């Protein structure tokens, strides 16, 4: 049924405008009890509402966000949009569109039904950086992996055999460096008697720099 | 003056009951509901208009309350349960969501497994190396990896990361990456990561020789 789905950029450069689509598929943006929302979620923090849209056009916002945000919608596309002015590092957020179901006669009963995946936007001055993917590879169970390293901003998704191998992944949190970029690691452990025979292959994913690389881990 | 939540964390067992509460910031009128947000994923409705569960959720999890002391509990905490759970209000046309609960789960001590990665014939052709040590699998998160350069012992040139807590067994993972340019990489022969922990009967070392 309903699905959302953001899009958008990754980076903002400090004072310019973010500028985020969340497009509706499974259902109309047209209808009578549902509202659009925003919400963002900054690192290591809980969850701010930043404004609802409803498709008529009429929009409400937080009030500390207000002077800034705006939120509109487009019935023609199927999609509303956040545009959010002079952003800040303050602002660097995963940015959350969700659907809001609304019922009642006599009073207007909300909650949050649907949400998307979010996108994550970094705030910053700095040049996207794709990263550089390097073979962790084995000497029972054995583990073998990849080295995903020197990337910006977040995030990067990673990915085995094309999704065929989930068993026993582990896709760490990305570190900050001394250098000012990411890096993480994913592993996989598996049987030792396939080595050699099995071919394992990691999937790495960076949007802001546009690289899609491919590694073949060999013992 | 604002929304509360208590505790901002627990660690329960699996089939404990959980109970957690949170205070609106007034006396409410619209839905009070909650939300359930695993590690990288977006929140997830359980809970709406204070009690009632969307269609789906387990059973095991219920909400009450009124006015604006309100509570969310679980009765039999499972693997998959571990989250971060908020509640959220809509008053004075605003929604606001709480500050949120953090449950982990405590379960028995299990040994990590131990594995070490040289770099990459790649990586070092750029003039850099790094020695990556996993520990796979362990309970509690506790754990120290220490980094020995022809049994000499390492410091400021590693990085940690953990995993969040397995959904299934509660494990986590670790890895340990030591850094250093490819110059004074070849400078050494024997690189090995030595790890303590409390599920082990003594540390346990992973090491191998360059060349």
């Known amino acids: 049924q309903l699905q959302l789905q953001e899009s958008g950029p990754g980076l903002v450069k400090p004072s310019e405008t973010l500028s985020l689509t969340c497009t509706v598929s499974?259902?109309?943006?047209?209808?009578?009890?549902?509202?659009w929302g925003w919400i963002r979620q900054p690192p290591g923090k809980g969850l701010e509402w930043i404004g609802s849209?409803?498709?008529?056009?009429?929009?409400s916002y937080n009030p500390s966000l207000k002077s800034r945000a705006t939120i509109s919608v487009d019935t023609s596309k199927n999609q509303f949009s956040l545009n959010l002015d002079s952003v800040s590092a303050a602002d660097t957020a995963i940015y959350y569109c969700?659907?809001?179901?609304?019922?009642?006669?006599?009073?207007?009963?909300?909650?949050?039904?649907?949400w998307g995946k979010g996108s994550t936007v970094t705030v910053s001055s700095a040049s996207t950086k794709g990263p550089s993917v390097f073979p962790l590879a084995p000497s029972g169970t054995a583990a073998l992996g990849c080295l995903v390293k020197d990337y910006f901003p977040e995030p990067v998704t990673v990915s085995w055999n094309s999704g065929a191998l989930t068993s026993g992944v582990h896709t760490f949190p990305a570190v900050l460096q001394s250098s000012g970029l990411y890096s993480l690691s994913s592993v996989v452990t598996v049987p030792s008697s396939s080595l050699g025979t099995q071919t394992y292959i990691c999937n790495v994913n960076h949007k802001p720099s546009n690289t899609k690389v491919d590694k073949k881990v060999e013992p | 003056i604002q929304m509360t939540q208590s505790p901002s964390s627990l660690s329960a067992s699996v089939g404990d009951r959980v109970t957690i509460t949170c205070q609106a910031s007034?006396?409410?009128?619209?839905?009070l509901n909650w939300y359930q947000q695993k590690p990288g994923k977006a929140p997830k409705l359980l809970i709406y208009?204070?009690?009632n569960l969307k269609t789906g959720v387990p059973s095991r999890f219920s909400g009450s309350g009124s006015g604006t002391d309100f509570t969310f509990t679980i009765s039999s905490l499972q693997p998959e349960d571990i989250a971060t759970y908020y509640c959220?209000?809509?008053?004075?046309?605003?929604?606001?969501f709480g500050p949120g609960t953090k449950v982990d789960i405590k379960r028995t001590v299990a040994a990590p497994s131990v594995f070490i990665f040289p770099p990459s014939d790649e990586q070092l052709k750029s003039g850099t190396a790094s020695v990556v040590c996993l520990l796979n699998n362990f309970y509690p998160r506790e754990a120290k990896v220490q980094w020995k350069v022809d049994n000499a012992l390492q410091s400021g040139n590693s990085q940690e990361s953990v995993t969040e807590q397995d959904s299934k067994d509660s494990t986590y993972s670790l890895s340990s990456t030591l850094t250093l340019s490819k110059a004074d990489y070849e400078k050494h022969k024997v690189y090995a990561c030595e790890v303590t922990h409390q599920g082990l009967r003594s540390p346990v070392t992973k090491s191998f020789n360059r060349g």
């Open positions: 969700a659907s809001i179901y609304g019922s009642g006669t006599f009073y207007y009963y909300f909650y949050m039904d649907v």
């Open positions: 499974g259902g109309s943006i047209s209808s009578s009890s549902f509202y």
């Open positions: 849209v409803y498709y008529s056009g009429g929009a």
């Open positions: 007034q006396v409410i009128s619209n839905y």
């Open positions: 959220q209000q809509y008053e004075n046309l605003q929604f606001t």
């Open positions: 208009d204070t009690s």
